[PDB]
Design a protein around this ligand. Structure first.
Ligand SMILES: CCCCCCCC/C=C\CCCCCCCC(=O)OC[C@H](COP(=O)(O)OCCN)OC(=O)CCCCCCC/C=C\CCCCCCCC
Ligand SMILES: CCCCCCCC/C=C\CCCCCCCC(=O)OC[C@H](COP(=O)(O)OCCN)OC(=O)CCCCCCC/C=C\CCCCCCCC
Ligand SMILES: CCCCCCCC/C=C\CCCCCCCC(=O)OC[C@H](COP(=O)(O)OCCN)OC(=O)CCCCCCC/C=C\CCCCCCCC
Ligand code: HEM
Ligand code: HEM
Ligand code: HEM
Ligand code: HEM
Ligand SMILES: COC(=O)CNC(=O)CCC/C=C\NC(=O)c1ccc(Cc2ccc(I)cc2)cc1
Ligand SMILES: COC(=O)CNC(=O)CCC/C=C\NC(=O)c1ccc(Cc2ccc(I)cc2)cc1
Ligand SMILES: CCCCCCCCO[C@@H]1O[C@H](CO)[C@@H](O)[C@H](O)[C@H]1O
Ligand SMILES: CCCCCCCCO[C@@H]1O[C@H](CO)[C@@H](O)[C@H](O)[C@H]1O
Ligand SMILES: CCCCCCCCO[C@@H]1O[C@H](CO)[C@@H](O)[C@H](O)[C@H]1O
Lengths: 59, 49, 79, 379, 295, 380
């Protein structure tokens, strides 16, 4: 059972509870950022400098 | 949320954006006779020639 | 700074309650929750809304009457 | 000895006023604003310093420094936003925190209340000076009208103003000393807030039913600490939603034009939280009258405690009073609106009325309904 | 202790008073009494125990003669297994500020007669032991809680208990204190409980052992108590446990053992709470729950 | 209920519970006065401070000029600066005895009351530092440039920490304005911690010159000490006014009358007097880090004094040995100061070096050692 395994190896020992929020948040950020950035850069396709960039970036 | 708001506020202190770019300066090695030193207002701090 | 113990004199009252872990987060959202959320709304909308509505009206009138007084009345130019 | 949470001359305090604090098992959400107001204060002060670290109080650079702060400082712009609006969110919260008190008669805790009033008065003043720092067109003309208010007092009148401006008309000396003022006042608020809360702790919190609660109290923690963290996030959402999605909704745009001591703008309105006052000052057509009406329009709060006639404490059980209370609220909503409008018909008359009705509901309709009510219970 | 049962096992059968209800004792009938005897007092569920200067044969012989009445169907040779009793974290508070002192009792679900862990548990319960006003021990007593209890006038008395049953049991402690020290006390206790789960030392247990040891020996001080040990042993453990055994089972226990077991049964467990008296100073299940972890 | 309205009023009770009925050793001397003075000192700096801040303009291109306009054009402005400028000193003077008083009579055994004290000192020190830069004079600058640069001694987060400080890549406007913010704020923090400081003290009562229980005889702060203090205040106020009225610039460097020039560091550079001993020590060790460290510890050592107490008695009154050693330390300090006043050259360099060693040594080894020896000579 995930919740049990969860409660046993994580949410129990106050020491590891914390250690989780840390390594946890970490992933969350990394992931969240990507999403929102994507959900955003997507809702504004072809309007961001990141999209227009190649029309002048001599390469 | 907290980690980001602190980052945000904290970089509010570091250098602004109106902090200029590079140098390049004019100097005639004949304006410095044999045996002397001179100060030039260079990129913020002095420059000895 | 201690207030717990010197409060008041109470006699013969039994209370029973259960650990949070033994009971539900939020229970009876439909058989008990909402039906009460309503009651409340019902009993109070008749003391509250009245004067608010009363304002709304006055606001529109005042506003409508003002925008009206800005327009021009022909009876001053038919001469 | 025993635990290090009740014998530590410091730790004991955070525990004697924030954890073991006995609270009515039943205070609602209208009791939350207390904290929010606090979190609000401490928060303004932070954005405040951060800001003050880039502003430059001097007519010839005030405006431009604020822009540079927005445009060139890392997240500066955001930092202003939060400060600029926090002020509103602040006034909002304080407003309910006052209504909560009126309805449930917390005003019977006189000292805890009176301080409150002083606090309001200071916040009001505080925002006034802050607003002038950006040295915009309003900033100026606001700074010019408000201070001028004291010129209504005879003799020491015209003369008192001089200190204020530090001149014979608003100029640099005014700006710089306002910046000083603004920097200082908040702290005074934080200070009086301490007295405010400290007075409250002699009596315990009031409660929605208006009757003894000793018969059942609960530790602020975790009952209200949790209730509050939630309350905070429920109010924080809209305030962020504005300061992130519609920064200038609540703000006049005229103040995007550098002060010009030569041209007072045509469409002049103070920021929302001062409109009701504005309306009243504008209701009476006399320098002094308007001022006085104004002065009392707020100073009246000191009286509320002596205008309580009901045998019960809260309105929960007095429908009559209740209707009169909501009539007062709405009455206020109008006054505000009226302030948003120019001096013309119908507005002038509407304003005039609403004021009369404001003062009257407080000075006569509440004490009168209050008594009547008792006799209808047979007391 | 009844209320403790009444809400610890609430809703089940264990959660009833032994003396039974006021209504029942007012209406029970010759009939009803009969059945109880008939339905319950049956040989496969009874034990003839005795101790003294008696010969075993000589004893059984008598049995054969008066406890006869052999059975036919397999039904009669069957021990009706009982419905499990659900433990429920909760509290029941009976207030009367008119009482001189207040009694509080906290507990977790026990392991049940069979479990070899009950040994460890009792070893633990010995570490905290018990105290009471008259104890000449005083501020020098070895029980941390006893010591603190004395140092700060925490309580008139307190005690640890490990009530065991067929399938379950209660494990905790009960103390009596003045309305103005229930708190501090409660607190010190819940702490000592934690200490158990987190830093019990080899000395703390060495003593505890030797104590338990001689406590069990005094359980066999005379004929009646020796007998009671047999009556109860057979009926619960299903045989007789010799002091030679009990002892070995104790010599086994060490710190590590205790720490794990107590964590196993105490750490972060919703407790059963029962308070009686002028109990205003103690006031929160949550807060108490919160005291079930870290320390 | 309560009879008089001086013990039941949740406010008035305080001024009466901490300033009137407050029990005090019947015998505290004059070295106990500095406590109040320090408070009156603070409360006073803050006044002259606001008044001033109401005319200053934190911005390199107008910093200097604003201060002069304040002196020259503001009614009594000039006076108001003087008082602020010197109050700082009077402030440090007072604080210095207030510490010595503590060392001699071992008040440091009231650990919390003491540790706060140290934090307080630290803040005041930092406070004056920022205040001094505002006028944007030559020192102001080069001072602001050297002191912040001190954090650049820490490795890794070093060079980088500095950046926040200056708000740039070298001292400039951003530095100045944020320093004004700092300076405006800190005082209040001092006033706040002073509350903790005093509040801790009130759990134990004041120490006293004989270093023995005093319960056997205490007296109300009022009027015994309220009066003793009003006098103390006027006895110190005289010289401080005498300077700020008859010799305004005695204690002040004149080099700072020349607008900051980021291009020329003056030849004769020495900090305001209250930082000389530090200065001397930082200058004693010929290594970036060593100097810093020595410095860091030259003050941070105060935190140790409480654990370096070995005498069975509390005050020195009855320990001549310790006493001599104590005055040796004082004088030792005096020198270090003087040394800071002098340039890096012989003999000075060597003299400085010694005095430092001797400072640290008297505190870390000679006090504890004499302390013990002493006991054995009383037969304990
Ligand atoms: C890349 C990202 C890296 C981020 C690094 C940050 C690391 C910080 C992690 C700290 C570790 C947290 C662990 C806390 C341990 C305490 C604990 O016991 O649990 C939390 C404990 C509750 O107790 P139990 O649930 O019973 O736990 C029992 C465990 N067996 O306390 C709580 O209630 C925590 C939750 C409350 C959150 C309050 C905050 C809400 C406010 C929101 C506003 C937004 C933030 C803005 C911040 C501005 C700051 C200037
Ligand atoms: C001042 C400047 C003008 C600013 C305008 C203020 C913003 C206007 C928005 C209106 C606020 C929305 C309020 C709607 C809430 C409706 C509601 O639930 O009311 C009924 C409800 C019933 O409660 P009980 O009788 O105790 O029931 C017992 C439990 N069953 O009443 C309440 O919630 C209590 C009333 C508190 C709200 C007060 C807020 C109004 C604010 C105005 C300030 C007024 C004071 C004067 C200021 C002078 C300067
Ligand atoms: C630091 C930066 C450097 C600043 C320099 C400080 C200025 C130097 C001027 C010296 C001060 C003059 C003191 C002379 C007083 C002589 C005197 O009376 O001494 C004897 C007298 C005897 O008292 P009892 O033994 O209790 O007698 C009982 C009743 N019959 O002793 C005293 O007055 C007590 C001593 C208190 C004075 C301490 C002041 C010295 C200041 C230095 C600071 C030292 C602390 C370390 C700071 C670290 C940073
Ligand atoms: C910066 C100003 C203020 C802050 C931060 C503040 C904060 C608080 C806090 C924390 C509480 C306790 C919790 C609560 O009941 O909400 C409180 C209570 C109270 N405040 Fe304020 N307050 C402020 C202004 C005022 C004002 C302007 C008034 C009205 C004149 C006021 C009147 C009261 C009263 C009557 C209570 C009693 C609460 C009760 O009825 O139980 N407060 N305040
Ligand atoms: C007491 C709570 C506070 C309130 C109610 C408040 C309100 C305001 C207001 C109304 C403005 C004008 C905002 C605008 O330009 O739209 C402002 C500006 C300013 N405030 Fe505050 N403020 C508070 C505290 C402070 C504090 C504590 C500081 C720091 C000492 C501070 C620093 C500033 C600065 C630098 C400005 C000018 C820059 C700007 O307008 O963005 N404020 N404040
Ligand atoms: C702004 C900072 C300070 C102020 C305004 C201040 C004020 C006071 C006051 C009012 C007293 C009580 C009267 C007296 O004994 O003089 C006191 C006591 C004391 N302070 Fe400070 N203090 C300050 C800094 C410090 C510092 C820097 C130290 C030393 C690290 C310190 C150590 C003590 C101690 C030990 C006492 C105990 C007095 C005794 O021996 O009876 N204080 N302080
Ligand atoms: C904490 C006690 C205080 C100390 C130790 C102190 C010290 C100083 C120092 C060393 C200076 C430089 C004086 C000079 O130019 O010779 C100064 C300047 C200044 N301080 Fe303070 N100050 C204190 C508090 C304050 C406060 C509370 C304010 C107001 C918030 C203030 C405002 C100023 C201003 C405007 C200047 C610049 C003008 C000038 O240099 O005269 N000071 N302060
Ligand atoms: C936030 O700041 C502002 O809104 C100030 N700006 C303006 O008012 C801009 C327009 C200026 C013109 C007229 N203002 C008024 O007549 C006016 C009158 C009363 C008040 C309330 C108030 C009184 C004293 C005090 I002290 C404070 C408040 C506020 C404004
Ligand atoms: C009053 O301000 C001053 O005297 C500052 N001005 C100067 O120091 C002028 C000369 C600048 C050059 C060198 N200064 C130093 O080496 C110097 C070294 C240590 C200190 C003490 C101190 C440390 C941190 C801290 I934070 C504070 C103090 C102070 C100054
Ligand atoms: C409860 C309110 C939580 C607010 C969390 C918002 C976190 C702010 O998020 C910010 O978004 C920017 C734009 O993508 C990024 O560039 C920043 O690095 C990031 O910190
Ligand atoms: C840390 C949170 C502080 C909240 C502000 C309330 C203060 O007020 C109370 O007065 C008592 C008698 O002096 C003190 O013992 C208490 O500690 C104090 O909280
Ligand atoms: C208002 C003057 C306050 C002096 C500081 C002492 C405060 C300690 O006072 C304590 O609270 C009692």
């Amino acid at each position: 059972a995930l919740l049990r395994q969860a409660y046993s190896a994580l949410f129990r020992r106050t020491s590891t509870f914390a250690l989780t929020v840390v390594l946890g948040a970490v992933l969350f950020e990394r992931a969240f950022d990507q999403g929102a950035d994507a959900i955003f850069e997507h809702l504004n396709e072809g309007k961001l400098w990141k999209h227009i960039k190649h029309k002048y970036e001599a390469s | 949320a907290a980690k980001n708001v602190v980052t945000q506020f904290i970089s509010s202190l570091s250098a602004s954006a109106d902090v200029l770019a590079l140098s390049k300066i004019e100097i005639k090695l004949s304006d410095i006779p044999e045996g002397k030193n001179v100060a030039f207002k260079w990129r913020g701090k002095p420059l000895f020639v | 700074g201690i207030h717990f113990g010197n409060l008041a004199r109470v006699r013969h009252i039994i209370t029973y309650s259960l650990s949070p872990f033994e009971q539900r987060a939020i229970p009876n959202i439909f058989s008990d929750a909402l039906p009460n959320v309503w009651r409340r709304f019902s009993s109070q909308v008749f003391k509250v809304a009245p004067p608010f509505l009363g304002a709304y009206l006055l606001y529109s009138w005042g506003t409508q009457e003002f925008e009206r007084l800005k327009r021009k009345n022909p009876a001053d130019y038919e001469n | 000895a025993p635990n290090i949470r009740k014998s530590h001359p410091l730790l004991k305090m955070i525990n004697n006023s924030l954890i073991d604090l006995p609270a009515p098992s039943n205070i609602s959400a209208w009791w939350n604003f207390g904290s929010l107001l606090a979190v609000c204060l401490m928060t303004q002060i932070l954005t405040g310093l951060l800001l003050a670290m880039h502003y430059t109080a001097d007519t010839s650079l005030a405006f431009s420094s604020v822009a540079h702060t927005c445009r060139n400082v890392q997240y500066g712009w955001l930092i202003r936003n939060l400060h600029a609006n926090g002020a509103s969110f602040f006034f909002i919260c304080i407003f309910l925190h006052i209504g909560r008190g009126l309805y449930y008669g917390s005003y019977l805790y006189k000292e805890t209340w009176n301080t409150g009033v002083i606090l309001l008065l200071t916040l009001m003043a505080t925002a006034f000076v802050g607003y002038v720092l950006p040295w915009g067109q309003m900033s100026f003309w606001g700074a010019t009208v408000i201070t001028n208010l004291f010129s209504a007092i005879p003799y020491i009148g015209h003369t008192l103003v001089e200190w204020a401006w530090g001149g014979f008309s608003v100029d640099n000396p005014t700006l710089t000393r306002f910046f000083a003022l603004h920097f200082l006042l908040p702290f005074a608020i934080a200070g009086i807030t301490i007295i405010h809360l400290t007075f409250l702790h002699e009596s315990g919190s009031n409660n929605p039913l208006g009757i003894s609660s000793d018969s059942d109290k609960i530790p602020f923690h975790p009952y209200y600490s949790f209730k509050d963290i939630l309350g905070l996030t429920l109010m924080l959402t809209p305030f962020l939603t504005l300061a992130l999605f519609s920064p200038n909704l609540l703000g006049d745009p005229e103040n995007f034009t550098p002060a010009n001591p030569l041209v007072t703008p045509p469409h002049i309105k103070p920021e929302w939280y001062f409109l009701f006052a504005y309306a009243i000052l504008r209701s009476i057509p006399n320098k002094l009258g308007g001022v006085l009406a104004l002065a009392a329009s707020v100073l009246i709060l000191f009286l509320i405690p002596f205008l309580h006639k009901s045998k019960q404490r809260t309105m929960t059980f007095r429908p009559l009073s209740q209707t009169l209370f909501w009539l007062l609220v709405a009455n206020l909503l109008i006054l505000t609106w009226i302030g948003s409008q120019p001096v013309e018909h119908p507005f002038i008359i509407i304003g005039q009325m609403a004021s009369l009705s404001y003062f009257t509901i407080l000075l006569i309709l509440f004490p009168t309904i209050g008594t009547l009510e008792n006799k209808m219970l047979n007391y | 202790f009844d209320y403790l049962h009444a809400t610890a096992f609430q809703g089940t059968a264990l959660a009833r008073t032994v003396e039974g209800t006021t209504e029942n004792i007012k209406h029970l009938t010759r009939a009803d009494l009969a059945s109880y005897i008939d339905t319950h007092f049956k040989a496969p569920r009874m034990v003839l125990a005795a101790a003294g200067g008696i010969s075993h044969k000589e004893l059984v012989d008598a049995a054969r003669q008066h406890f006869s009445g052999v059975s036919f169907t397999y039904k009669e040779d069957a021990v009706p297994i009982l419905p499990r009793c659900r433990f429920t974290g909760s509290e029941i508070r009976a207030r009367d500020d008119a009482l001189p002192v207040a009694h509080v009792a906290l507990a977790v679900e026990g392991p049940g007669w069979a479990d070899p862990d009950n040994v460890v548990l009792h070893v633990a319960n010995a570490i905290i032991g018990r105290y009471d006003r008259t104890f000449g021990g005083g501020k020098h007593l070895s029980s941390r809680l006893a010591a603190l209890a004395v140092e700060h006038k925490l309580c008139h008395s307190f005690q640890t208990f490990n009530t065991s049953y067929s399938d379950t049991g209660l494990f905790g402690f009960h103390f009596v204190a003045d309305p103005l020290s229930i708190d501090d006390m409660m607190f010190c206790a819940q702490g000592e409980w934690m200490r158990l789960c987190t830093s019990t030392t080899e000395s703390e247990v060495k003593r505890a052992k030797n104590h338990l040891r001689s406590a069990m020996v005094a359980q066999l001080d005379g004929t009646t108590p020796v007998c009671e040990t047999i009556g109860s042993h057979l009926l619960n453990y299903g045989r007789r446990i010799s002091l030679e055994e009990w002892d070995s089972r104790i010599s086994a226990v060490d710190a590590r053992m205790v720490r794990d077991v107590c964590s196993k049964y105490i750490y972060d467990k919703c407790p059963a709470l029962a308070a009686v008296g002028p109990i205003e100073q103690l006031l929160d299940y949550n807060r108490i729950r919160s005291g079930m972890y870290w320390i």
